[model samples]
Structure formats: C-alpha cells, structure tokens
Target: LEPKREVCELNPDCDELADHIGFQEAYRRFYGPV
Candidate 1:
C-alpha cells in the first residue's frame, strides 16, 4: 500500500493536502481492511 492520502493540516486554511506516513495502517486497524 502507498501513502497516497490527501493529508492536510488540521484546518481548512491549509488547503491542498500531502502524503501521510503510517496512515493507512492505523486506518485499517480501525476499519478492518477492505
């Protein structure tokens, strides 16, 4: 899996997100994969 997620700051003022490391792994732990 790649970290191609749109990772934005904690606010809308910071538009245009970037890549986040280890996001998918934590997300999968909660959502339980696809």
Candidate 2:
C-alpha cells in the first residue's frame, strides 16, 4: 500500500502547519480558546 498521507511526505511547510495545529490544539485544551 502507498503512504497513508502523501501530501506532506516531503514538505516542510506541511510539517510546520501540522505542528502549528497541534500547538493550538494543546493550547486550547489547557488554556481555552485558540
């Protein structure tokens, strides 16, 4: 089978966005609101 997510398999920007989303999620969970 191919990669489950090939869109950002080699994209730094995609990785950055992923991290940004994760940070916001964690922040919201702990402090409320994004």
Candidate 3:
C-alpha cells in the first residue's frame, strides 16, 4: 500500500487520529516515517 493508504489503513478514523495527534503534525509524521 501507498503511504496515504497505509496511514489510512492503519488509522481507519482519520478524524480521530487527527484529533489525537493534531492534523498537521500527523501529516508530517506520517510522511516522515517513509
């Protein structure tokens, strides 16, 4: 799976994950992990 797909797959609820970690930070970290 692609990065976005993997992230979305791992976190089915994007809103919840964003709420937990903060959307900008989550986006950065998700890409950073690549």
Candidate 4:
C-alpha cells in the first residue's frame, strides 16, 4: 500500500507522541517486511 507521501508527510509533524511508530509502519509498507 503506497500511501501517498504527500498525505503522510503532514502527519508526523503535529502528532509525534507515537515515538516514530507511524514512520516505522509506513516505511515497512514501502519496503516490505524483512
């Protein structure tokens, strides 16, 4: 699921109490689970 970067780019800035969890999930989606 290539979640539009433009869509998620705006997510990390405001809600970062998640400890980069959002970034981690999104990155894995983009690069497949190892």
lDDT of each: 0.35, 0.43, 0.48, 0.46
Question: RMSD in angstroms, candidate 3?
Answer: 5.4
- Off-target runs (Cα >4 Å) in candidate 3 are 1-14, 32-34
Each prediction's TM-score against the native?
0.26, 0.29, 0.24, 0.25
* lDDT: worst 10-residue window of model 3: 1-10
Model 4 pairs whose backbones collide: none
Q: Tens digits of per-residue lDDT for model 3 on 1-34?
A: 2445345546754435545664444444555432
Can you write out model 4's per-residue Cα lDDT over 1-34, one digit (the tens) per residue? 4544454456754235245454445544544441
Off by over 4 Å in 4: 1-3, 13-34
Candidate 2 achieves a global lDDT of: 0.43
Give the CA lDDT, 0 to 100, for residue 8 in model 3: 54
How many angstroms is residue 34 displaced in model 1 relative to the true structure, after the best TM-score fit?
6.6
lDDT string, candidate 2, 1-34, tens digits: 3442344435554445466463334333333444
Which sections of candidate 1 miss by over 4 Å? Answer: 1-20
Candidate 1 residue-wise lDDT at 27:
45
- State the weakest 10-residue window (summed lDDT) of model 2: 22-31
Error of 3 at 26 (Å): 0.6
lDDT of 1 by residue, 2-34 (tens): 532343234332222224443344444334441
